[PDB]
Amino acid sequence: ASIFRCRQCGQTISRRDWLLPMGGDHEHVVFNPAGMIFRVWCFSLAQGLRLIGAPSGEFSWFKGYDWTIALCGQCGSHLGWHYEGGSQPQTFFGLIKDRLAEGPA
Ligand SMILES: Nc1ccc(C(=O)N[C@H]2CCC(=O)NC2=O)c(Cl)c1
Numbered sequence: 001a002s003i004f005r006c007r008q009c010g011q012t013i014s015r016r017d018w019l020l021p022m023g024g025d026h027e028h029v030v031f032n033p034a035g036m037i038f039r040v041w042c043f044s045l046a047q048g049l050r051l052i053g054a055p056s057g058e059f060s061w062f063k064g065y066d067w068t069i070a071l072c073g074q075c076g077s078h079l080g081w082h083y084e085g086g087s088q089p090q091t092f093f094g095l096i097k098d099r100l101a102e103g104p105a
Pocket residue numbers: 031032033034058059060061062067081
């Protein structure tokens with residue numbers, strides 16, 4: 001149970017080793033303005049994504065950070081967001097836990 005893949009297509013996305021405790025915990029339960037609730041896991045690093053659009057600070061769950069939508073680069077499924085423009089760390093990923101599949105190397 002080391003590697004996280006895209007649940008839809010199996011694209012390699014991230015590792016458990018790259019979990020990042022932002023503000024005390026790697027898991028944050030959040031809701032967007034459309035009322036959708038997400039369990040978001042924070043990662044220092046990710047791969048196999050495609051970041052779409054320019055960064056936006058509107059409705060950012062993480063103070064000091066602007067967000068870009070992160071799609072699965074393979075199948076185009078929305079996996080979360082990339083965060084940038086902040087400090088300690090400058091950038092990180094917030095990925096939707098239930099859209100990932102955990103398994104071995
Ligand atoms: N009409 C919509 C529908 C959904 C959204 C959304 O998911 N927004 C996220 C972006 C990442 C974040 O940190 N906070 C959010 O709220 C937005 Cl901004 C407008």
